[PDB]
Design a binder for this molecule. Sequence first.
Ligand code: HEB
Ligand SMILES: Nc1ncnc2c1ncn2[C@@H]1O[C@H](COP(=O)(O)OP(=O)(O)NP(=O)(O)O)[C@@H](O)[C@H]1O
Ligand SMILES: [Mg+2]
Lengths: 573, 586
Amino acid sequence: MRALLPYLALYKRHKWMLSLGIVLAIVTLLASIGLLTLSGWFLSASAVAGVAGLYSFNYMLPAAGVRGAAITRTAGRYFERLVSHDATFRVLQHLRIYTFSKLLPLSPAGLARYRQGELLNRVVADVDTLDHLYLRVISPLVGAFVVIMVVTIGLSFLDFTLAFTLGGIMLLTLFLMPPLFYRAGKSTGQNLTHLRGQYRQQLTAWLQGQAELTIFGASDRYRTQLENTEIQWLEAQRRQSELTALSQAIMLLIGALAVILMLWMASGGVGGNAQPGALIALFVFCALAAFEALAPVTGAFQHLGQVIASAVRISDLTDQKPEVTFPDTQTRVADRVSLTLRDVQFTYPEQSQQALKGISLQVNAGEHIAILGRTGCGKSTLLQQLTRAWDPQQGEILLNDSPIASLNEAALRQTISVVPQRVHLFSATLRDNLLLASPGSSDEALSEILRRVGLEKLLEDAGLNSWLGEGGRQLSGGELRRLAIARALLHDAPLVLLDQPTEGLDATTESQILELLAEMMREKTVLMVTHRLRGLSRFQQIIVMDNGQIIEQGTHAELLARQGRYYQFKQGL
Amino acid sequence: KSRQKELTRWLKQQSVISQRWLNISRLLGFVSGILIIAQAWFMARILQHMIMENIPREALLLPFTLLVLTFVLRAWVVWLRERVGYHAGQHIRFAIRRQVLDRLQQAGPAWIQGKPAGSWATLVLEQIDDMHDYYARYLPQMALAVSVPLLIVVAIFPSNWAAALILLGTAPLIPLFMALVGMGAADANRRNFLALARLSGHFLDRLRGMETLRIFGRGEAEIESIRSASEDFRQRTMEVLRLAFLSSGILEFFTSLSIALVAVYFGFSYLGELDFGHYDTGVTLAAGFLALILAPEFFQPLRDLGTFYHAKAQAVGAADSLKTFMETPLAHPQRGEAELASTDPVTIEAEELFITSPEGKTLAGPLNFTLPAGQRAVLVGRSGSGKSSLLNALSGFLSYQGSLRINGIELRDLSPESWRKHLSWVGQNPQLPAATLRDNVLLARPDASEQELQAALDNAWVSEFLPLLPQGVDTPVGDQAARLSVGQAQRVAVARALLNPCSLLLLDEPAASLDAHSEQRVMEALNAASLRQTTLMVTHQLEDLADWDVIWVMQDGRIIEQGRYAELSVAGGPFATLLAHRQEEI
Ligand code: HEB
Ligand SMILES: Nc1ncnc2c1ncn2[C@@H]1O[C@H](COP(=O)(O)OP(=O)(O)NP(=O)(O)O)[C@@H](O)[C@H]1O
Ligand SMILES: [Mg+2]
């Protein structure tokens, strides 16, 4: 319950729609109880009065109560559904924004804790569970406690001992039963997660390795232990369901203990009176309808285990320390960037080298560079430091003779336009996968770029309105690398980083992109990282390096005469 | 008709698997409808005695004892009814998970490969378990909404035909109102349940692509995108929910009028204003408490049915995907009965061969290759050539419309369970499926002499990295080969392929994206392994194909070149262009 505090504080926004939907839940539940308690009295009062006491009865006031307590039961239910669903969609919207606003400052680092395919799916399914804390937990519990108190307070004007014996019974089962069935079904809840996550392990292995199992003949014996885990899983689901069927009987017994006690103990004196008469039916019919408010409180407490379980999962990721901080200053982005590196590492130490020092390459204001390194030696991790994924620990990056850490976030993003190795489609209109780079751009300025890059195919049918990503029309590798370059062109930045262009692309497309890189970014300094010796003549100042250290350096023409490692890379192996 | 009703029809067709459990659950919903009446009759007769006749409580013990007995019986039936209800839903989930795994097992691995395996486990775990509450709670309850209300008026009718008409009068008016205009929006609710799921795939998309959002500075302009998307969903939904909750409100109105009209009719009947409903006999007090206690119990089964709305709505969405899964037409490879006589190297030949995906789409165009026994051929080409489609066809995972004759016997006529015993495959991704590395290698044959297992480990260069693992050979492999690296994951796959004698060995990009040292180790094992039987290797490492006797180049699904490496290197054809491209990568 302590884990929920950061997410209860999100309710301060929309604290009227949330509380109105709990107020209407109580008002509905009291018109439900009041109408049956007033009806139970009216039959008992009139029958005891009989025909003789017709004129002394004054039935007019109950007829106003019946009309009053029946309008509020209907309107109260209709508006407790609308308000508590409207309030549920606001908090979902506020959890989605808050989760995104916290995960953003630590997007590249920190979030790489496991396979992001599963991590990002159990954050979406955890925000949806923190969205159930209002209607599925808070509302049935808070609503039932106020209804128990309002009944007990209002039912104590007649007989104090009779109110606290009904309220006391209801208050015990509100506070003793939900924490006691949760405790009884906590062990099986553990045995139900250890098996559900073990069936997904065996199923995913059996599905993915279906080629390696049919060939080797084990597809039928690795499905038998899969079917064997489901059987244990289903048995553990039967025990958990054999417990919910107990809290549904005990609720029907406690609600029967209260009825029996009100029939019995109100048979004697109700308050001062020794024969209550109509007051007997008022108490009994209140114990009949009161336990309607206690129906969801049990199940609303085991779903508190799920919500708390997910309130630590989100608090684990969101409340992480970002590794990068940005000064809050306003600066102008220059049109000529001369990147200068000094003593900054190019690769995490591999094979326990413990000697890799930082490179010290210098990039002129408008000259293209091409860092050419061996594949499989280590991660490139050079674009991370330039885009400030994490502040470097070896040396300093100087961008246009001013520290890169001294550059504002909104200005750093405008001085560096990077195309990554992994291009992403945002499952939106093709127009909005390019409005990404330039927030304000005429819709024609896009379409000229598409043909200008070589994407006229995407304009053939429903150009700029087509669906991409998961909604369909996944782009091919060559089709996709051209899209990333298209984004960078719109997001005009003096310095352009290319993580690894023409990787996994064929020679016809490889020569297509490399030329497109040449004239298009003539004025815009680039720093291209690659391990392919294609079309590097148009480049200058080629940085060829292996095992974390610079071996030689110079223009492609210079390297061939130098007869160094680059020449070896050119002829044979 | 409607997508809403054609799924509910599907959901009713699956319930036959457990129609026995749904009949005890319907029967116990009829016993529970009687125990309610016995509960109310005793309470009305208890109340009348102590209110009108002023009988002391101590004299009333036969009704009190029978009243406590009835309350216990109701709790027993309620306990019984929700355990019979679970079995009604489990025995359907267990038999649809068998209908899904079979359809996925019957379909080849290429079909499975279409969707990520994390989306196949959504269909099997999270979308079959969603249908439990429909069969365990919504279907038993929808039969409790006809068993009890009918049984209530039938019990009240002997006592009073007017109080039995106030209740029964509203019996048809509710299903009309919930179907007059509510049904127009119930399907419109199913469309919102799809938007809410698609909206959570729009939030997920933003989360997945935060790295692209960061570098372009669209962090704060995609929060307004989350706000606008969450506001359109809320606005669209409550144009629908403004009408879908009338059914909840109206039903709560006809249960308020009925309790109001029962109280007013009996109240004035006692006062003498109304003198018609009774059977020409004085309206006893217990004749008014019987109807008043049962008036909220008349509508209780229907009001509990609103509570189970999401039980149906999350099963109609689940049945939306399951039904379209068992209904999508899939072409399966033809299963024959012939089997190879001998375990000698096979001879592969093809004549106008067309390899087709499960959906009938052709993956490999006309192939006319011919591979003599014992000859190691190589398949090279640009990405998307369809080279894998050929190695999958020979494995029997794809259906072909041409002629592909193993030893002259057509591959269709080959019974797979006997053909796969003459086969071995390494593949691009190792995909180890067992738990312990020792059993990963022994997957070929479950029991082999330690001489054989050790022979595989040394020949495949698995022995040199066992010490690096904590427990050595018996190390667990864990989720997707996490405990060990991809470089030495592939080497375990090689040891699995070398463990059994084979007649045909297929190697689909073994060194692909592999660690530099472990790349050389595997090549050394396979180049020695490929000599013993008919081998067919797919590779892009074109610089060392000198020894392999036949080289096929695949472009656009068809083989466009053939011959040994010596003459293709200088021929200037497509292979030379591919060779030139590969020579640049370092
Ligand atoms: C699609 C559309 C929709 C949606 C989206 C939703 C979404 C939701 N939801 Fe809902 N609902 C609905 C439609 C809906 N819904 C309905 C219609 C109903 C009805 C019920 C009655 O009738 O009463 C409900 C009802 C309901 C309820 C109550 C039940 C009873 O009665 O008990 C609850 C609790 C809920 C929760 C919820 C949540 C949490 C969510 C998340 C957000 N919901
Ligand atoms: N199971 C499948 N169903 C439908 N289409 C498929 C399937 N498998 C492959 N395809 C497509 O049809 C062609 C099959 O090519 P494929 O055999 O996968 O290429 P490949 O030769 O393995 N490529 P690579 O591994 O990069 O060398 C491609 O256009 C695929 O996208
Ligand atoms: Mg392949």
